[PDB]
């Protein structure tokens, strides 16, 4: 029985960067992946210039699926749920509702686009630290579960054009009245940077999202089958190093996944309001960690408070 | 009024809204090992808080006059301005921390006057 009490007429502000509820989630997740699904290769370069260390263990593979994790607090420690519409991450909340435990959060450790998570408010929501600084990572979440069918991934085109259209209009509302925003191909980097890691039946297919971001939107269609990759050896996302796993049980791997989120990089030129250009990438472990628990804070109390009076009662 | 259902300037109706809430302070292999320990720790903490609540010198609610003089260095409250309206947060933690400093001093003073009179009265 999840408990929740709405707070009326409480103009409570919320910052998705100073939560402190966020602080414990990645610690629980890293400790869990360690006790958990194990690679056959562990690498930790450390100066003990540095000495590359290595830990070898077994790597069994099982069908994996994220389960919802609510976040409960000890005695006291009241948690507050922001439930407004216009939430830009570092913004106030008219509709606040305290909770004893968090909502049905379904997190997924992933790359650029958040998989199987929560939803934004009515189109998408630009919740990043800075909206149009060429120095911060864009933090947006989806509003519709974008179904991606991977066998290579048969990415739909109408839903992709619609999500690009909703995000492009929100970017224009945030910045640029009469502006054209065009999408560019990948930024460059590692496997998980150019391509996208996601839970596909336990495995991680890797499709470069460069054939998806080439849409020119104007202010004034069966399946985009991208080329994915069978995952056996990748850089570890927990820390700095590499991994190695067991071969898949399927040659053509079937999976059903709904992706909900939009975290990507940007060129950063100026190119300010003439045209806006954005590239895929991003999906930090530290930032996805902040992205799940973005509307809360923890406060506690003892039953007290005053009124200075002249009541004078004995004792 | 409500569990955070008002927004106004500070000091009195919070004594009144908390007065109404306090007037109706009651609002009236298989199955289990981890949840029970949390309930035990919660009741241990609550009861430890209650015995510490029990060793106090006020024992009264929302209108209490325990013995520490909220001196003129702290006293600036006009007579009728004491009970009007009160919400206000960063200001509140400082107000609430001030509430507690008077609380510990107050109960220590009533414990001191109760103890002092206890030694001196001696009330036949």
């Amino acid at each position, epitope marked *: 029985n999840p408990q929740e009490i709405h707070l009326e007429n409480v103009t409570e*502000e919320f910052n998705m960067w100073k939560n402190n509820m966020v602080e414990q989630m990645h610690t629980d997740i890293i400790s869990l992946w360690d006790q958990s699904l194990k690679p056959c290769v562990k690498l930790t370069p450390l100066c003990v210039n540095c000495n590359t260390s290595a830990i070898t263990q077994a790597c069994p593979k099982v069908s994996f699926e994220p389960i919802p994790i609510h976040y409960c607090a000890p005695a006291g420690f009241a948690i507050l749920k922001c439930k407004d519409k216009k939430f830009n991450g570092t*913004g106030p909340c008219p509709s606040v509702s305290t909770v004893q435990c968090t909502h049905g959060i379904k997190p997924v450790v992933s790359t650029q686009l958040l998989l199987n998570g929560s939803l934004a408010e009515e189109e998408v929501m630009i919740r990043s630290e800075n909206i*149009t600084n060429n120095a911060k990572n864009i933090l947006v979440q989806f509003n519709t579960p974008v179904q991606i069918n991977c066998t290579h991934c048969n990415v739909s085109k109408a839903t992709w054009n619609e999500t690009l259209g909703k995000v492009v209009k929100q970017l224009r509302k945030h910045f640029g009245n009469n502006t054209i925003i065009r999408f560019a191909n990948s930024s460059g980097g590692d496997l998980e940077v150019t391509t996208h890691s996601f839970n596909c039946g336990g495995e991680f297919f890797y499709c470069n999202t460069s054939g998806l971001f080439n849409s020119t939107w104007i202010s004034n269609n069966d399946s985009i089958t991208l080329p994915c990759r069978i995952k056996q050896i990748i850089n570890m996302w927990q820390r700095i190093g590499q991994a190695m796993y067991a071969p898949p049980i399927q040659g053509v791997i079937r999976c059903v996944s709904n992706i909900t989120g939009l975290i990507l990089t940007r060129d950063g030129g100026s190119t300010n309001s003439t045209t806006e250009t954005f590239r895929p990438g991003g999906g930090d472990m530290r930032d996805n960690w902040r992205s799940e628990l973005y509307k809360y804070k923890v406060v506690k109390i003892e039953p007290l408070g005053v009124a200075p009076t002249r009541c004078k009662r004995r004792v | 009024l409500g569990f955070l259902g008002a927004a106004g300037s500070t000091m009195g109706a919070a004594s009144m809204t908390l007065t109404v809430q306090a007037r109706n302070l009651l609002s009236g292999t298989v199955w289990g090992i981890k949840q029970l320990q949390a309930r035990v720790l919660a009741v241990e903490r609550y009861l430890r808080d209650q015995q510490l609540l029990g060793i106090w010198g006020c024992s009264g609610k929302l209108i209490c006059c325990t013995n520490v003089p909220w001196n003129s260095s702290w006293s600036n409250r006009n007579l009728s301005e004491i009970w009007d309206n009160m919400t*206000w947060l*960063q200001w509140d933690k400082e107000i609430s921390n001030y509430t507690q400093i008077i609380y510990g001093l107050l109960e220590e003073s009533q414990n001191q006057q109760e103890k002092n009179e206890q030694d001196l009265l001696a009330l036949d």
Partner: nanobody
Framework: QIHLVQSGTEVKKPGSSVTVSCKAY?????????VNWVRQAPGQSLEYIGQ??????????HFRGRVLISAVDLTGSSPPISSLEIKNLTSDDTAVYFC??????????????????????WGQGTLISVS
């Protein structure tokens, strides 16, 4: 690591309006950083005019109906620009204007009282001789 910059030098006619700025480097938004506007008689003390907390155009009763505050929120390519509108600039309105950027998100350490917040940083100071 945070510096505040106000508008430059401005000389207006007697009985006019003013539009001064308050640039805030290293600041995100007025939603998190409310700005309280304070004037200053040239050489004398500083009198609090009003504030723009939570994008609220307001001023004191002494300044009501003559001063309203707008704070154009920009971040990234441009710092948050807090403007100030004071109508009917008489010769008596010769003053040095001031803005103040302080966080509103931190709500349990000591920064604010019913809008009147702790003035941590200040801008340059705009001497305006209405002539």
């Amino acid at each position: 690591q945070i510096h505040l910059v106000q508008s430059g030098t401005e000389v207006k006619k007697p009985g006019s309006s003013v539009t001064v700025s308050c640039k805030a480097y290293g600041v995100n938004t007025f939603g998190l950083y409310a700005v309280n506007w304070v004037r200053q008689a040239p050489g004398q003390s500083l009198e609090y005019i009003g504030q723009i907390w939570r994008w609220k155009s307001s001023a004191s009763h002494h300044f009501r109906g003559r001063v309203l505050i707008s704070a154009v929120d920009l971040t990234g390519s441009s710092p948050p620009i807090s403007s100030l509108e004071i109508k009917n600039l008489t010769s008596d309105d010769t003053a040095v204007y001031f803005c103040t950027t302080t966080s509103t998100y931190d709500k349990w350490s000591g920064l604010h009282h019913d809008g009147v917040m702790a003035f941590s940083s200040w801008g340059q100071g705009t001497l305006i001789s209405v002539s």
